């Protein structure tokens, strides 16, 4: 259901669980690409997307700095593991 | 293109942009739901239900492990999301109710 058609917290939770799983799945696919490849330029882009989507840019930049650094460190681990 | 079908770094960097934009857009839709949920709360202090959050976190962590990702990191990431959205829900609840 849309946010407007939600009749209670149970409807809300159905939608939020789906969004959050979508996010985790996208993050999983994101790692496959990073592995296949084996911040200052990436964050302004993502801060713009945040604003465009009605979200606080600096919070969303915090989320992406966290992500990008994790995936960078994992790429380094993965490289050593596979060479 | 799939990761295997990618011919160089350019393909991968653009796919990552599209995935990252998908996540932002999903996070934008998530905020709409969180703000709509405020209608179903009798008080600012019931934002959030502590047992809801307590069951949400291991579930996302478990999803992470099932998708090739580190549970502690992804659980921490969702802790931050849920926490910030809680604050945003509270602002919205106060403004409207
Ligand atoms: Ca791009």
From Swiss-Prot, chain A:
Kindly list the positions annotated as binding substrate: 13, 30, 75
Q: Which residues form the signal peptide?
A: none
Q: Does the keyword Lyase apply?
A: yes
Record field: pH dependence: Optimum pH is 6.8.
What regulation of activity is recorded for this protein? Inhibited by endo-oxabicyclic diacid resembling to the conformation of the transition state.
- GO MF entries: carbon-oxygen lyase activity; chorismate mutase activity; isochorismate pyruvate lyase activity
Keywords in alphabetical order: Isomerase, Lyase
- Listed pathway(s): Siderophore biosynthesis; salicylate biosynthesis
**Under what conditions is it induced?**
Repressed by iron.
Q: Which reaction does it catalyse?
A: isochorismate = salicylate + pyruvate; chorismate = prephenate
Keyword Lyase carried by entry: yes
Domain named Chorismate mutase is located at 3-79
Where on the tree of life does the source sit, at the highest rank?
A: Bacteria
Residue ranges of coiled coil: none
A Gene Ontology annotation in the biological process aspect, one of them, is:
salicylic acid biosynthetic process
E.C. number, please?
4.2.99.21, 5.4.99.5
- What Pfam families does the annotation carry? CM_2
The record, for InterPro entries, names: Chorismate_II_sf, Chorismate_mutase-related, CM_dom_sf, CM_II_prokaryot, Isochorismate_pyruvate-lyase
Kindly state the subunit structure of this protein: Dimer of dimers.
What is the role of this chain? Involved in the incorporation of salicylate into the siderophore pyochelin. Catalyzes the elimination of the enolpyruvyl side chain from isochorismate to yield salicylate and pyruvate via a rare pericyclic hydrogen transfer mechanism from C2 to C5. PchB also catalyzes the nonphysiological Claisen rearrangement of chorismate to prephenate in which the pyruvylenol tail is transferred from a C3 ether linkage to a C1-C9 linkage.
Q: By what name is this protein known? A: Isochorismate pyruvate lyase
Q: Which organism is it from?
A: Pseudomonas aeruginosa (strain ATCC 15692 / DSM 22644 / CIP 104116 / JCM 14847 / LMG 12228 / 1C / PRS 101 / PAO1)
From the UniProt record, report the name of the gene that encodes this protein. pchB
């Amino acid at each position: 259901k849309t946010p407007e058609d939600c009749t209670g917290l149970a409807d809300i939770r159905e939608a939020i669980d789906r969004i959050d799983l979508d996010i985790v799945q996208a993050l999983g696919r994101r790692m496959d690409y990073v592995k296949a490849a084996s911040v200052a330029a990436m964050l302004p882009e993502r801060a713009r997307w945040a604003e465009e989507n009605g979200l606080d840019a600096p919070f969303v930049e915090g989320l992406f700095a966290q992500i990008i650094h994790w995936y960078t460190a994992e790429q380094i681990k993965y490289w050593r593991q596979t060479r």
